[PDB]
Amino acid sequence: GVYATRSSAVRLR
Amino acid sequence: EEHVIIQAEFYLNPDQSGEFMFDFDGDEIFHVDMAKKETVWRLEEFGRFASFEAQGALANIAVDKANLEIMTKRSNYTPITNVPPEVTVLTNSPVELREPNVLICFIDKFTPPVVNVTWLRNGKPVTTGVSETVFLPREDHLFRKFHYLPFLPSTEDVYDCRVEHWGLDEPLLKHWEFD
Amino acid sequence: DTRPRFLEQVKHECHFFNGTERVRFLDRYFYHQEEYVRFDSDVGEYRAVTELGRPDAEYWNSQKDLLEQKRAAVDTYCRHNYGVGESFTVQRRVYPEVTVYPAKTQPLQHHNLLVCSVNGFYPGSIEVRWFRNGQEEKTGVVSTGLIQNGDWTFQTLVMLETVPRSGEVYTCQVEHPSLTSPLTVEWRA
Ligand SMILES: *[C@@H]1O[C@H](CO)[C@@H](O[C@@H]2O[C@H](CO)[C@@H](O)[C@H](O)[C@H]2NC(C)=O)[C@H](O)[C@H]1NC(C)=O
Ligand SMILES: *[C@@H]1O[C@H](CO)[C@@H](O)[C@H](O)[C@H]1NC(C)=O
Numbered sequence: 001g002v003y004a005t006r007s008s009a010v011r012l013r
Numbered sequence: 014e015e016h017v018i019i020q021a022e023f024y025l026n027p028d029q030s031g032e033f034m035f036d037f038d039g040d041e042i043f044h045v046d047m048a049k050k051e052t053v054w055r056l057e058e059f060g061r062f063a064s065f066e067a068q069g070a071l072a073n074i075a076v077d078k079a080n081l082e083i084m085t086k087r088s089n090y091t092p093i094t095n096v097p098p099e100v101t102v103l104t105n106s107p108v109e110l111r112e113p114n115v116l117i118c119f120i121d122k123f124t125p126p127v128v129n130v131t132w133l134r135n136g137k138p139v140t141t142g143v144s145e146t147v148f149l150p151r152e153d154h155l156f157r158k159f160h161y162l163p164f165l166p167s168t169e170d171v172y173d174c175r176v177e178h179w180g181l182d183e184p185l186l187k188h189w190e191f192d
Numbered sequence: 193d194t195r196p197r198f199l200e201q202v203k204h205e206c207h208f209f210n211g212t213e214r215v216r217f218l219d220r221y222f223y224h225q226e227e228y229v230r231f232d233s234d235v236g237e238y239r240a241v242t243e244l245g246r247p248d249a250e251y252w253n254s255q256k257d258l259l260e261q262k263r264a265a266v267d268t269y270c271r272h273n274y275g276v277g278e279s280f281t282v283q284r285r286v287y288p289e290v291t292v293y294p295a296k297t298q299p300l301q302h303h304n305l306l307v308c309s310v311n312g313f314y315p316g317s318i319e320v321r322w323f324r325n326g327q328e329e330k331t332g333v334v335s336t337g338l339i340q341n342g343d344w345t346f347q348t349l350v351m352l353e354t355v356p357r358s359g360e361v362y363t364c365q366v367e368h369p370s371l372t373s374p375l376t377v378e379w380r381a
């Protein structure tokens with residue numbers, strides 16, 4: 001199987 | 014709980030250092046080599062059973078980099094306080110003369126995740142056969158790290174693990190010699 | 193190098209109870225050592241942990257698509273990854289090698305310490321007990337505690353303070369998930 005990446009949320013500029 | 018899996022990431026300025034790893038119950042499953050853009054399994058067997066698209070780690074680190082800039086600004090440029098490491102040297106098995114063993118240098122409870130580690134044999138730097146882990150996350154959000162030295166035990170050799178960290182006034186040496 | 197450092201951390205955590213029957217997902221953001229905002233699957237929205245994280249909580253909570261990604265994580269991320277790694281993590285079992293050797297509490301003195309060295313085991317949960325002639329000895333026992341080797345193995349030393357007498361047989365007993373019955377090692381004076 002393939003490990004999935006949780007993504008990191010983008011902070012507002 | 015029975016188990017915890019953590020995807021842990023960091024980015025550090027001004028060093029521009031970034032790490033991405035997976036932890037299972039306190040052990041590293043894998044991390045991503047950012048320069049090579051490759052997945053490094055902690056035990057080689059792991060990679061025979063699973064895969065990971067290293068590129069996804071790169072995308073996250075880029076986000077972490079952008080977020081750090083924002084948060085640095087939000088905090089009015091409040092920097093990290095150095096927390097110096099605790100260092101322990103031990104062997105991986107009971108020691109027997111001229112029976113192959115491994116010295117372990119455990120570097121614990123420190124931040125930022127930047128350290129210089131040197132193995133010394135009789136006061137001299139040694140690099141033959143050494144290995145090390147990436148920075149490993151702690152639940153108090155400090156860090157852990159391991160350095161390893163295969164060696165042949167003898168009455169004639171002493172060893173030291175020398176650790177430099179910005180939280181230390183002078184380098185820390187932890188000694189080992191045959192009991 | 194005295195230049196100030198600034199550190200960002202993110203920890204995406206999956207917590208498992210009873211296999212995958214109950215799962216909790218935490219999306220955690222840190223500045224230096226301080227957690228400033230988090231998504232808890234128990235809640236289903238981001239919450240500021242400190243004032244510093246409030247803008248992020250509010251911005252992220254306004255993004256419905258982002259929130260639904262996080263809300264599905266227990267399934268699409270946690271349960272998935274558990275399935276991927278289960279055969280070599282959850283099911284990983286390595287028996288310990290057990291060695292008993294005498295030692296000294298203070299130099300020059302005769303042997304007055306028995307070391308039970310327990311090495312190379314996984315997972316970490318272990319029970320080590322000392323016996324003198326078939327009777328458990330609970331006094332004078334000291335240990336290193338559980339030591340991680342960093343390579344998916346553990347070790348621990350369990351020491352018994354004792355003055356060995358001729359004829360006595362000491363036993364170190366080890367219980368561990370990898371074993372189906374206690375592992376015992378004898379030491380004779
Ligand atoms: C790790 O090793 C280097 C060895 O010198 C340390 O020092 C350097 O410090 C100067 C200070 O002006 C700068 O050039 C850099 O910060 C370092 N690198 C080089 C190549 O000079 C470095 O600080 C050590 N790190 C720790 C945490 O002790
Ligand atoms: C940063 O400074 C601004 C004004 O200069 C102030 O309003 C704000 O509270 C400060 N933030 C922190 C985290 O100290």
Ligand SMILES: *[C@@H]1O[C@H](CO)[C@@H](O)[C@H](O)[C@H]1NC(C)=O
Pocket residue numbers: 210213
């Ligand atoms: C754990 O899981 C099993 C089956 O999935 C279930 O029958 C049991 O009720 C659960 N609860 C426990 C072990 O407390």
